[PDB]
Amino acid sequence: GSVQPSRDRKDKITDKIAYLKYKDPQSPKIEVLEQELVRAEAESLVAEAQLSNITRSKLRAAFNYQFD
């Protein structure tokens, strides 16, 4: 639940970039938005890994304890 908002924000930034590119290509906000998008992508790249690292361990430990 804590992990999800990062991907939410990345999707929002991507949608904003896609809309603003269509509206007018001459806006000066393309570069800053692209930099923000690449920053969010770099963050999510490690966020997904740290989310997927612990699930397969905690689930296994809990189920082993329950079965014992």
62 is a contact residue toward a copy of itself (CB under 8 A): no
14 is a contact residue toward a copy of itself (CB under 8 A): no
* Residue 30 token pair: 């393309």
For 24-58, the three-class secondary structure string (H helix, E strand, C coil) is: CCCCCCHHHHHHHHHHHHHHHHHHHHHHHHHHHHH
Cβ proximity to a copy of itself, 32 vs 67, nearer residue: 32
Residue 56 exposed, middle or buried by CB count within 10 Å (0-12, 13-18, 19+): exposed
Cβ proximity to a copy of itself, 21 vs 60, nearer residue: 21
Q: Which residues bind a copy of itself (CB under 8 A)?
A: 2, 6, 18-19, 21-22, 28-29, 31-32, 35-36, 38-40, 42-43, 46-47, 50
